[PDB]
Amino acid sequence: KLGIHSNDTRDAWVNKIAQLNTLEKAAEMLKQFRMDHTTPFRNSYELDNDYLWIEAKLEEKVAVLKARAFNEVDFRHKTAFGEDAKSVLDGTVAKMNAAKDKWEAEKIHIGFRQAYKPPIMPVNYFLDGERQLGTRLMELRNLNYYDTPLEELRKQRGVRVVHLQSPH
């Protein structure tokens, strides 16, 4: 069963997430899923065409569980892991403002997303960080954006150049 919106690999995960029944397990599988299949730093691209959809289907399970396991006060200030939302926020922002360069700043931001993206961290705190983190990341990146020639930039990025072709 191959397909764009409906395929075996997707049906395989729905049955898998269905076996979940503990906020701990669910939240953990989500944190791990994001480390394995999202961002340019994912562990592999094996789920490139289905990870975006599968992720959401996991977030749903975690969301429902966190609602029936947390109290009103925590669902608003506590992460699915048990951490204190605001603490995590102010901490990550601390590191970001300390970051020595864009290379360091990007690692923090991306890492933050992979670990605390809702249903993990409350949306209010998350988007608040997204606001502060993104600001710093851009400030460092967009400074003398064109100074570094492509040859060097490629090295800095650490990409494996496979082919270059230019008549001019």
């Binding site: 340019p40 997204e130 851009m138 967009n142 954006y145 150049v161």
Partner: protein, 510 residues
Amino acid sequence: RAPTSVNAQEVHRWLQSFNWDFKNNRTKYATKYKMANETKEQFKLIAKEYARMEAVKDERQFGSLQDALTRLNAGVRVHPKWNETMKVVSNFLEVGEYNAIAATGMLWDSAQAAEQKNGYLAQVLDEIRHTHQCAYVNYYFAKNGQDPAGHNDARRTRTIGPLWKGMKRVFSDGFISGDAVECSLNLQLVGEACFTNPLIVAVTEWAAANGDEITPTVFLSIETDELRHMANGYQTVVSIANDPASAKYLNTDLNNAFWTQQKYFTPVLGMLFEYGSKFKVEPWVKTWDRWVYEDWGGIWIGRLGKYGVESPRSLKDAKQDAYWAHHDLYLLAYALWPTGFFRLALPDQEEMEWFEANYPGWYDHYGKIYEEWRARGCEDPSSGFIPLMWFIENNHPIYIDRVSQVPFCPSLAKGASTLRVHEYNGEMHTFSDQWGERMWLAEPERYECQNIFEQYEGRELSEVIAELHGLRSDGKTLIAQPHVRGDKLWTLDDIKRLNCVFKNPVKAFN
């Protein structure tokens, strides 16, 4: 007891004081600039006056559509090629109008001055009006036209083809993802001022030439709202011209914004105009030069010089890559015709003469190729031939720029032919220019869009079409077609028999 009332300006005079200070009174979006909290807007409007000025325009517009135009059968007496072109033009612009709503909503959240917020707000509403206006054009052509398919379901059938991906980059994601000011530059300073604004008017000209009086009626009305949006973009710069960060970032966000928008419109618009019409209005090379170099790059940008704004550094490059860009792209668009939601036609004899006259050398390259495909039967469903096969046979791989999503074929292109392929953490990436390459290298997490070859890899063509509903009401005939005549329409079976299976062209470097 003289009859007395109050107008918009009289209320607007105190609009600026509507906002008050407090700890958390700041934008919720990440940005590098600071919009002055005392920035003013050009038009002194309030919600009620705004509605009235727009309602009056709606009256004329819908009045003409429902009455006279319908009585004249304006929806039908349009050249087949243009009926098709409007499926793309209207719907693709629709998403541009729609994301502009969210974009200006983000700009409204960014502005601190009540007046600047009010200006953006006015656009939020205009963009909603424009979304519904573009929607209405497709709706009207579906209801009263010679071929409803595509017009009636573009919102879902557009997902099948590659041209849609790049449209989302310049008119969806480019409008709302990134620093608010960057989005402002993509949408207003560059998008609308350089392309959108002139495009809307030009479209009404090509439309009229091809018998289409429906589009001019709607688009000319949309046109009347553009002055408020121009001012918004202009005011965006004035709002940050004082902030020191501006001198550090404004020119690079602008250049990136310029390259982003031209990268798509330079080839796509010229293609839709020259190849999606029968009667011509003006050669795209001439048009492009006037729009981008004369009007925008010169007059418009020149007036922002006092604010530190500089002409995009990638401008010279844009002009070199431009000349053959649209001609190169149509070859790919037609070769992949089964992936669209509109019917395409090969140039007729008068047109081939027109192309050669305006683009010396066109015939020896593009002309001979089209005649070869036609003689081979690309228009006849019993031929078993789809031009994509000719690209494979002659080893001319087609790639998708990882950043712009624009399709390009370096081995055949008469225009740019540069190609940069990189591998990073188990994933291949293909780029068509030095600016897009830098964007990805510096911001790899901003561009992870999967291209059609990646998604459709290993899939047989007819299966992808059937799955994404690329069929007409009879459930057998394709929406897309390699010609615009009424007979010999290709069916899902005609495609299935080709046994065409997608492959990721980048894997050949392994």
